[model samples]
Target: MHLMYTLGPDGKRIYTLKKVTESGEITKSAHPARFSPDDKYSRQRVTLKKRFGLVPGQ
Candidate 1:
């Protein structure tokens, strides 16, 4: 799997999951700040946490 992203309302990173095997370069699965998990401990989560200092929960 790979990652992709776009800026959200407050210029935040909205992460998207992508498959290395897929042909398209579009964002299908969006992990927005409001809905994304805090303790899952994935690469996306870690990066977001450190870079943006994203707080837990909405």
Candidate 2:
């Protein structure tokens, strides 16, 4: 999986974890992996920050 996303109107990076095949083709990923900047700091959010270098909204 790899990190990808778009910016929201509130200046937050909405993240999505994309899956890929060993053949180097991108496959459809699930929405459950999405990260919202509005979310309170949690283990999931911390994981995003440490792995993807993303910061949470203050």
Candidate 3:
């Protein structure tokens, strides 16, 4: 699922999901992040670019 999420000014990851399954959208998908857990996959994309110590970083 190509879940494109954004960072709000308040400092939060904003994205969409559903009951059938959990999903997250990065600024771009088909990304290597898709291989990891949704939470990690999603956070990696955000955390790396953010560089603010939100989730985890490589």
Candidate 4:
């Protein structure tokens, strides 16, 4: 999977974009896989830190 970042009025977020191989294989599955609104923030933060270099201390 590949990671990217976009800054907006709300804040900064690390976006998780799908990783496609030259052979057209997807490395990661689509997110919100189970769909729970309450988990959004936590999930996003974790993904952001791991993928885009966001640190916990800020």
Best by lDDT: 1
TM-score winner between 1 and 2, please give it: 1
Candidate 3: lDDT of 29? 22
Question: Candidates sorted by lDDT, descending order?
Answer: 1, 3, 2, 4
Best by TM-score: 1
lDDT of 4: 0.31
What value of lDDT does candidate 1 attain over all alpha carbons? 0.37
Q: Cα miss at 44, model 2 (Å)?
A: 1.7
Instruction: List the lowest-lDDT window of 10 residues for candidate 2.
Output: 21-30
Score each candidate by Cα lDDT.
0.37, 0.34, 0.35, 0.31
Residue 6's lDDT within candidate 3 is 47
Off by over 4 Å in 1: 8-10, 20-58
Task: Give per-residue lDDT, candidate 1, residue 18.
Answer: 41
Worst 10 residues of 4 by lDDT: 21-30
Please tell me which model should have the higher TM-score, number 3 or number 4.
4
Q: Report how far residue 18 has shifted in candidate 3, in Å.
A: 14
Cα error, candidate 3, residue 46 (Å): 24
8-28 per-residue lDDT for model 1 (tens digits): 443455554445422122223
In the order shown, the candidates' Cα RMSDs to the true structure are: 9.4, 10.5, 11.5, 10.9
lDDT of 1 at 14: 52
lDDT of 3 at 52: 20
Alpha carbon deviation, residue 27, candidate 2 (Å): 11
Report the lDDT of model 3 for residue 31. Answer: 30
TM-score per candidate, in order? 0.27, 0.26, 0.20, 0.25
